[PDB]
Design a protein around this ligand. Sequence first.
Ligand SMILES: Cc1ncc(Cn2c(C)c(CCOP(=O)(O)OP(=O)(O)O)sc2=O)c(N)n1
Ligand SMILES: Cc1ncc(Cn2c(C)c(CCOP(=O)(O)OP(=O)(O)O)sc2=O)c(N)n1
Ligand SMILES: Cc1ncc(Cn2c(C)c(CCOP(=O)(O)OP(=O)(O)O)sc2=O)c(N)n1
Ligand SMILES: [Ca+2]
Ligand SMILES: [Ca+2]
Ligand SMILES: [Ca+2]
Ligand SMILES: [Mg+2]
Ligand SMILES: [Mg+2]
Ligand SMILES: [Mg+2]
Ligand SMILES: [Mg+2]
Ligand SMILES: [Mg+2]
Lengths: 524, 524, 524
Amino acid sequence: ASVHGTTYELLRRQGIDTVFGNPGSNELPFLKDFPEDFRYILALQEACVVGIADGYAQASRKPAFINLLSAAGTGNAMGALSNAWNSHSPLIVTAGQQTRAMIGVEALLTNVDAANLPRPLVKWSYEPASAAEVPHAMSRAIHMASMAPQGPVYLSVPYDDWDKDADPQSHHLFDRHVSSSVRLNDQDLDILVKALNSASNPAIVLGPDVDAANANADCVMLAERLKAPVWVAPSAPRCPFPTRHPCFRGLMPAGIAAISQLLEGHDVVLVIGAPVFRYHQYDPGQYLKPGTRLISVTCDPLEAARAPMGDAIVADIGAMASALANLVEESSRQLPTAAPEPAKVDQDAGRLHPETVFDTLNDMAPENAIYLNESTSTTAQMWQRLNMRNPGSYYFCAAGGLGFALPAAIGVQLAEPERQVIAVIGDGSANYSISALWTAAQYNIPTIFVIMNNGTYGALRWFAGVLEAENVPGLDVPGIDFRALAKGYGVQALKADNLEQLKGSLQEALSAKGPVLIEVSTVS
Amino acid sequence: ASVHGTTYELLRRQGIDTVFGNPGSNELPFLKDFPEDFRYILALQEACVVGIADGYAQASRKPAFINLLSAAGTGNAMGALSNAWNSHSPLIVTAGQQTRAMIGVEALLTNVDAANLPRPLVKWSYEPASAAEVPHAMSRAIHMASMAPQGPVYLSVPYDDWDKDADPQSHHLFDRHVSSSVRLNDQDLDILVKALNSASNPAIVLGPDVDAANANADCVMLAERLKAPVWVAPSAPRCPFPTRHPCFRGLMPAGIAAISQLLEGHDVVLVIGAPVFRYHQYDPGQYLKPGTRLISVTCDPLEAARAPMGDAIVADIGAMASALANLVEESSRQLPTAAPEPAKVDQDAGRLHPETVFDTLNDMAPENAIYLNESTSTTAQMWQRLNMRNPGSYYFCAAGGLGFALPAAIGVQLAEPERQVIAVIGDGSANYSISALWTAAQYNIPTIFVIMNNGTYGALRWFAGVLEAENVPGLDVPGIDFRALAKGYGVQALKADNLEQLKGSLQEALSAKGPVLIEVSTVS
Amino acid sequence: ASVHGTTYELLRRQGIDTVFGNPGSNELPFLKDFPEDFRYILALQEACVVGIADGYAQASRKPAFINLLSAAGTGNAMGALSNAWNSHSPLIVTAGQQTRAMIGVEALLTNVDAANLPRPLVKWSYEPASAAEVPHAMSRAIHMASMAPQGPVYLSVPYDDWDKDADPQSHHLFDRHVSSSVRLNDQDLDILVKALNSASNPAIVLGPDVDAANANADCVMLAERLKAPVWVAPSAPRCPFPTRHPCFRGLMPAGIAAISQLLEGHDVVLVIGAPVFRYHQYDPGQYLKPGTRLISVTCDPLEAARAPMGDAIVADIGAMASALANLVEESSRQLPTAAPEPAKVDQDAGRLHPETVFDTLNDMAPENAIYLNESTSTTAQMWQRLNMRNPGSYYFCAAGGLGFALPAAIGVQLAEPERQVIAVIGDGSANYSISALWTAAQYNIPTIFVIMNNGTYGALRWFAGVLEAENVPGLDVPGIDFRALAKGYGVQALKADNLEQLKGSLQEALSAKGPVLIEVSTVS
Ligand SMILES: Cc1ncc(Cn2c(C)c(CCOP(=O)(O)OP(=O)(O)O)sc2=O)c(N)n1
Ligand SMILES: Cc1ncc(Cn2c(C)c(CCOP(=O)(O)OP(=O)(O)O)sc2=O)c(N)n1
Ligand SMILES: Cc1ncc(Cn2c(C)c(CCOP(=O)(O)OP(=O)(O)O)sc2=O)c(N)n1
Ligand SMILES: [Ca+2]
Ligand SMILES: [Ca+2]
Ligand SMILES: [Ca+2]
Ligand SMILES: [Mg+2]
Ligand SMILES: [Mg+2]
Ligand SMILES: [Mg+2]
Ligand SMILES: [Mg+2]
Ligand SMILES: [Mg+2]
């Protein structure tokens, strides 16, 4: 067998059947004779390729496979990889290298010092020393991406390797099963359970690895048993809990002082599947108030190491959440009371308040909708106003890198064809990966894109105001016609300048058979 | 003085007055109180920011300054940096880092292991150990970018550093002059000159560092004195010689065998300002034929080290070209005869042959036009059909990374306001950095964009055909309306479905007061 | 509190009380006011410092703390770090950096790009961005070294940081408990147990992480229950099983074909705490024979990823071994028969056969002796001839890097004062870290060093013979007087030119109150 044949067999035997790519000359020998059981999803720029694959992986809860051209293609994707690192997304990034005979002279398209290029944003990065090693290196990539803590990996392959003879002993790779589905030993787990049972006023904080593990329902049972309020850890990339459950307390502010204040009076705080903590703003103070102790369950040694406070346990989130949910006592305390409904913001017949948009989405979207957020000044209101009952219902750029949501929403929609995906994206953010729209059109992936257009980088204006920073350039982005951009890439386009138009446009979009972009005129 | 004040003073004292950027929260403390004598050029995505800065630097022959947001912003620009490395572009890339107090916890927007992120695509990469070091680190960045061989550099700055007190001793940085304007010692230069004088059939090959050095006119004199044919080294990022000069022989094919065959019978081949050589296709054979010896003058030790044949001299291209041009004897041999004019390809009243487009551009464009090429299947014809008399008249992605020409053409036009820039870009390539169009509209930078639309990634189809590679996915890009994309970003748009429309559209574009995009229907 | 005070408090609260070091100017501000409850162990060169710390960590089963001077001191230790990486040794390597104000100018003793220096041989490598971050960075280092898979880490600290004020919130670091004591979830563990119970002819292979975990006794129970032969995985850094237990089958040859042949007929092979596999010699063939399936339990994702065959489970070795030992059925098969005693090699009254030396050591050493091996041509015989009943009884350079055993034997002896350490080291190997002898003398650490002197690099002569490689230089090391070297560093020295002298010298050494070196004349 050839390296080509052996590698595709390994991929299919390991459950991979889709290649997200933007093709180049170093990859043609890999892509030729493309297997009939595989599908190829083209995107027009590599940030888009990786964003789509990322959404697909996160929603499918399985690795996604990417193919890019050498250094330039990899380079165009590195902002997307920064998000993927923070979301623990299992991505296998392959990049074609020059033929081995032309690497030394640094022919055009040689990826120089290739393995160093995507560092430090990958778990493992490698170029094999010979063609026959390629299937083994691919096996390593698959497992490195897939083991807890999941994350992106990188493999560089000289284009002449594919046609070479494979090692017959590569067949041992095909069916390898590698597990990191582990939990704390019984003795120490019993100690943890007793500490939770004994707490007088426990609180729970959940992060994105809960949703990645589909541990959401187990966390609901845990919270119900402990009668504990539940917060989502700050800078949340995913939604780990039903947002109208009585225990739910919303998104934590991303500040040190703010969080210790919220946790004041809680004697034991159990954090599951989050860094401790993904703060953002400068908000100095105590990490925890006296009387609060913190216990973190994380899938990632790097998270456990860097937490500035608390104990930690490094284990699989699914296995730990299930065990805890089924082992803790049913507390006799009263179940927390549900948060009150959000206020209706006054809305005239003109430009839309973001609150109006979220309320209307919540009113009209199906109960199993999936939302993506890249409307950076409106996150707090979004979190308060969307009832997200089910797992896998929310995604936000995990490293704060704009250009995620537009392509990721296409990948999520591909992963979940029966769940309507609605991406709420600011006018500024929409541009970073605008060309991803084309993929939705070409493959008829029926994502709805809601562009919140207020003409400015609003979150930056807000932060400037905080800093009392005057005379900052580059904060306004006037003069973008999003309906024209949508037309450019073949996506149906609607406009909503007021509430009645928003309702009409959403009705049309929800009944459409293809992707739709709605440009919403929002308040400045 | 503050670090902010001291750093802007250093920048202005070192000739920097423009910041190319996409703003983020870690950069607001740098951008606040933006000096009135500086200008800020916003682009909507970081590949665009860097592409614009790159074109500006290459055309201006001076460093350009870039400001990006942390890891995600830097990451989005890494494909653009791959080109900049290969073109020796003097780019100073600054990226804002989290406040020092929040780096340890890896708060959102922390650039982890920051200096490693852009490696291996930068000459120098650094994060200072204290705020007071920032001006010195900036000085290092300026000089590292600017010394031969020029190239991109990276500086990461925690956002809290800017407001801190500067070291008064930083004033010694302001007026430092650093020179690498060096040439071979007299004794060895005399040996080289004698070898050139003694050659019976010399040939000259020129690369992009000739144009970067503005050594073009000196190379013309050298070629005239030696009565030598002149080729442009393969995969050419720039044009180093007047393309209708009698000595000119065009673009070398990017193959080992092809080049040794072209050089056969030439006893001494002098290469100036090029790698030896930027081959691309697999074309095995002899590096040089018997009877040919090669001497390379390069600004880059890495080029000299990796050449598989010939002697080399590492020195400044401007200084070496000037010295050689003025020292060699006037040969009594006959001056080479000019290449014949290109044939006119038969053209009916339908879709345009690329040859027709280039002939028409050559007929209608001003003699001091500047062209950019990202029409990947048409490069050979472009090189044959455009009379480029002046320096700085051609740019092509130096690492082969698409997404360069569209933003770079805006930067070039900004650098050269009196020279009409015309970017010829394929329908595939146009998408990578499509959002750069907005910058041209916003700042009214009157670049003309000619989109060669044939619905496919033609160069890849061609290479697949060569490989006899069947069943390759992802090679077609139907369904893109470039006039709508132009409208989306505020750029006047025209279409040309045939020759009469092409002529009409070019006439309108050449007389326009702002940027213009022309979508040309080209043959498949 | 100062950063100095806070950091030493963190260290002591995390169980660290010893600093292994070679001092330098960048570390004087750390070492000043050295706490009275800490001890400092000086060694004369940094390979020795790290080797001693490594032996100490491995034997103590807890992290060891190292302090070195900048780049040169770190650099001198990098061979020692290569071994530490392969043995998963929990080492915290700190290196002093220049004062922050002098880093930019690259003053003497600046560690340039410090975090990159020890890569790729460390789990985590870092320089903090401010003095107040130092305690947090130290906390990260402690936990990164200590979490499974354990390994070395690196922290660079500017010397001016120590005297600065600490953040009062650093107190939250002091008592953090971080656990990776995890095992496979119940459902999947039950599946594994059933597979073991159902095996008709199981085999067990054990690696060094078993001994590191003190899982040895649990593995004995597991082997007894399954009635399974037990091998030690190739290139063994530690001994994971009693070598005279009836199930023991010895050290596996480090070859692909050899191992699949040994395993032929075994239907299920359970590997615990080893890479699959640390082969050495080229010995091509089948990874496994038909009819054999392999299941690996490893603490290290990198091991699980790269295994070319088998299933894998990534978990704590102690937790997994305990669970398996207590869950499997008692097989009704016959217990394996103990390996026969080794043959006595004919020995005349002249130079010693290595077999004679090992037999005599086995005859005379206490039953709780600890051996180290750096006698590279005699490993197979050593493994056959020493009865090692207890855990922690054997160490061999895990990356094959010579210079380990001599210093490591001192660290092991320091860790285990009641167990006589006997290091068997070839004449070649003895030189790499010869200066470590001084530390044994100075601190009166009573290690016995047995130098096997045959005047040559015997293992290399053997491998050359295999390659049929003639005319290899540099294989002989005549003219070294090891008794004089011992005298040089203050260690009592004896010679043994024949068996009667060997017995006499060992009797004297075993009754000595300090370290002793015995130079043994062995056969060529
Ligand atoms: C790749 C990248 N570039 C720049 C930024 C900086 N940035 C920018 C530019 C924001 C403004 C986004 O504008 P928007 O129109 O999408 O939404 P709002 O007006 O609601 O803020 S928020 C923010 O962090 C970023 N996070 N990521
Ligand atoms: C960043 C990046 N991605 C992908 C490629 C691969 N690529 C691609 C996709 C080409 C086709 C460009 O299509 P076009 O429409 O711009 O021009 P032609 O039809 O004349 O080839 S040429 C080529 O090398 C690349 N060079 N750089
Ligand atoms: C740091 C280092 N340098 C060189 C070697 C190469 N080497 C060398 C030099 C060996 C010979 C050791 O000689 P010895 O006297 O200690 O033992 P033998 O005579 O029994 O081989 S075995 C071996 O792998 C090595 N493993 N590590
Ligand atoms: Ca906006
Ligand atoms: Ca095309
Ligand atoms: Ca020897
Ligand atoms: Mg990198
Ligand atoms: Mg699905
Ligand atoms: Mg100018
Ligand atoms: Mg290194
Ligand atoms: Mg002890």
